[PDB]
Design a protein around this nucleic acid. Structure first.
Ligand SMILES: [Mg+2]
Ligand SMILES: [Mg+2]
Ligand SMILES: [Mg+2]
Ligand SMILES: [Mg+2]
Ligand SMILES: [Mg+2]
Ligand SMILES: [Mg+2]
Ligand SMILES: [Mg+2]
Ligand SMILES: [Mg+2]
Ligand SMILES: [Mg+2]
Ligand SMILES: [Mg+2]
Ligand SMILES: [Mg+2]
Ligand SMILES: [Mg+2]
Ligand SMILES: [Mg+2]
Ligand SMILES: [Mg+2]
Ligand SMILES: [Mg+2]
Ligand SMILES: [Mg+2]
Ligand SMILES: [Mg+2]
Ligand SMILES: [Mg+2]
Lengths: 59, 114, 155
RNA sequence: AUCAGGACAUUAUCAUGUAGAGAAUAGGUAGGAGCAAUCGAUGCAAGUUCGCUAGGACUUGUUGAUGCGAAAGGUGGAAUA
RNA sequence: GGCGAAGGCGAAAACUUAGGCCAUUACUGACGCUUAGGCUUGAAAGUGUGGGGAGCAAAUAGGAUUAGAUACCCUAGUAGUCCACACCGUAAACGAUAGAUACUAGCUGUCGGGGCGAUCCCCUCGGUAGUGAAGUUAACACAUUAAGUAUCUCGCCUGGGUAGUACAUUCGCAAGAAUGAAACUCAAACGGAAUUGACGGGGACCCGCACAAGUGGUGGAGCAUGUUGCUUAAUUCGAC
RNA sequence: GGGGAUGUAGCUCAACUGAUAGAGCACCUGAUUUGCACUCAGGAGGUUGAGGGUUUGAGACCCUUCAUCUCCACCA
RNA sequence: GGUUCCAUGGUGUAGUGGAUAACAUAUCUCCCUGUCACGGAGGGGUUGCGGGUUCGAUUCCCGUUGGAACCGCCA
């Protein structure tokens, strides 16, 4: 996940790096604790439904 | 004695480590919350990560480098306090690449605490 | 659970040196509801200060009280075990009030004689940053500096 | 037989170096009491000596005709060519 | 979201192979539905033999917490989790809804084939979802993928505890699986749905000397007064 | 017997080859707990074994004793 | 029949080389709570019997009880 600073400003790099780290932190924390295959599928469907329902009203 | 280099900043949920290294291998200096003198639970607080970054930045600045590629690591909580600490130290941050190990579904992770 | 901020009563400008703060410390050393007695005690100490320090008593009192005034305040916040403290910036009104309370509290415990000389010695001993009230201010400041990490989290 | 390494001895290498006080890094003794001048003054620049981060001596560069109160003056346990 | 009858199936490729959808001016001409017995498959754990073992972790050891902790936390850690060949045949194996057939408003999605030809969108035939009236239900709710109107066939139920226990039988190396009562006991049941409250170490909001910020006290001493206990002929009775 | 060690605070040990009398834990008070502890602040606790000398000065350097710790040889 | 060990508070155990007796549980009083358990503060309670030595015995010595541990063989 390389992001160049552009040497024009510093904040902007951290303004993009915050997003990249959040999606990065999601998978990093997922492969930390062991859940059953059914529960893993359960958690995937749970995340998809949350994201979907939020996007419906933001669209 | 080297102008450019790499500083690995690992941020564990329990502790943090800042290693200043040559562009390829051969670390020049290292520091951590434990070596500062902080002990126990306090080692996991963003303020401590900023403190650790400040000491290593001061030490490495007297050695005389300018350009730094910042390889952020770990999944702690003070992942950005050290980042701001280096920027306030005044080193030229060139890259913000993140290299926390991510698996592709290899090895079974540990049990869930309850 | 109250949602209302309490009013404030007037502080009154002092009747001699015209320095409000004198009335506050008078009220602080008050015991048994004797306004008269407290004024006499305090005023006698400025006269002793004249006899000893050869300087203006109001200037000495400000130099003592202003030097004693703290900067950081540590508020107790328990979660699971013991309390992790939190340093916060105290308002200006409370700064003078806390300073006066400590001045009186360590003054009524000195090994000296009549509280006139007792309280007189504490203020003159605090104008040179070497006394009992100073140590208290030093201790809380060092405790706050040690507990700098948790300052960000308050509640 | 040969190579490389550090052990410990050295041939041979002389600054080092830090009571106060003393103007002073005082390593101990300069025999002493003025002495050095192409047997070359003086000058300031660069590096190094080690540190008691003040100072030390040395080298290099300028480099040229008087320096040396570290002779005589100084205090001190220790001392001034 | 797709596929399979179910369990299940997700890096890439090759070989072998199963079923399904749509259109049929083709063909056979009732050859169809269900299925006692029988056969096949059947998550994970477990078994037997031989390999494999990075990570993790039943059993086990230690450190914590605790009144105690053989548990929740942490550090180690064998069997096991993996492969080949043999068994075991149980799960909340759930859509808690057997299969087949015909009919019964509609609306919104999404997937595949076909018709048109930029997509997008329209129509037809099917699969998978949401909303929804008649209709059904004790209610929740189902509602063209029915729990609706009806027919065929199979399996199963007859109060609760005893009890999925005991005996007999079949299978299995083993743990066990299938089948499966009675004596005795109760007037009901860890019955179903829904309603009003209460409660929650469940959330959201709002209050009070509640906490917070201060002041002066109490618990320590002497004394006054009331009470408990004890005693006494009585220590009158009540208030806890 | 021979060699090598040590003695500094209540309990252990640093010093520093001569110019500081120290560190840590025990004891005490303060902050802080539901406690128990952990943490944080302050404080004390010394003929530096004795004796003699060095040096301008010592606990130290040396000499000698006292006590304990180690060792390391042993045909009456 | 013989030999070694032990006897400490209400219960389980340490010490004392003669001058001195603690630990835990238990018990009591008071915080604590609606109450109680747990928790906190404080309080309290000890050498088997005898007989000698010593100025002084739990300790040292010899006997007497009770409880244990060992042995009691060769024919
Ligand atoms: Mg874990
Ligand atoms: Mg299995
Ligand atoms: Mg165990
Ligand atoms: Mg582990
Ligand atoms: Mg096993
Ligand atoms: Mg079943
Ligand atoms: Mg519905
Ligand atoms: Mg029955
Ligand atoms: Mg059955
Ligand atoms: Mg039952
Ligand atoms: Mg109800
Ligand atoms: Mg309050
Ligand atoms: Mg009272
Ligand atoms: Mg009392
Ligand atoms: Mg009564
Ligand atoms: Mg009554
Ligand atoms: Mg009470
Ligand atoms: Mg025999």
């Amino acid at each position: 996940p390389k992001i160049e600073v552009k040497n024009d400003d510093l904040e902007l790099a951290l303004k993009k790096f915050k997003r990249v780290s959040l999606e990065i932190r999601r998978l990093a924390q997922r492969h930390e604790y062991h859940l059953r295959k059914g529960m893993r599928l359960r958690e995937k469907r749970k995340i998809a439904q949350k994201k979907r329902r939020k996007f419906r009203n933001m669209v | 004695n080297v102008s450019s280099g790499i500083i690995h900043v690992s941020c564990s949920p329990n502790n943090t480590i800042v290693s200043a290294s040559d562009p390829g291998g051969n670390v020049l200096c290292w520091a951590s919350s434990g070596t500062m003198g902080f002990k126990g639970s306090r080692k996991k607080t963003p303020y401590s990560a900023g403190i650790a970054a400040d000491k290593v930045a001061k030490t490495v600045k007297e050695m005389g480098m300018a350009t730094v590629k910042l390889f952020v690591k770990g999944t702690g909580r003070g992942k950005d306090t050290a980042i701001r600490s280096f920027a306030n130290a005044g080193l030229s941050i060139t890259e913000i690449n993140e290299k926390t190990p991510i698996p592709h579904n290899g090895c079974k992770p540990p049990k869930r605490p309850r | 659970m109250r949602k209302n901020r309490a009013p404030k009563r007037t502080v009154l400008p002092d009747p001699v040196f015209n320095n409000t703060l004198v009335t506050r410390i008078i009220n602080v050393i008050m015991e048994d509801g004797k306004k008269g007695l407290a004024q006499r005690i305090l005023y006698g100490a400025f006269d002793l200060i004249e006899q000893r320090t050869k300087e203006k008593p109001l200037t000495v009192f400000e130099r003592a009280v202003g030097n004693v005034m703290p900067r950081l305040e540590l508020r107790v916040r328990r979660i699971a075990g013991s309390n992790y403290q939190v340093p916060t910036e105290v308002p200006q009104d409370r700064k003078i009030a806390l300073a006066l309370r400590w001045i009186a509290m360590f003054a009524r415990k000195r090994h000296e004689k009549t509280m006139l000389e007792k309280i007189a010695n504490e203020i003159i001993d605090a104008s040179n940053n070497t006394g009992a009230a100073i140590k208290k201010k030093d201790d809380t400041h060092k405790m706050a500096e040690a507990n700098k990490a948790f300052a960000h989290m308050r509640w």
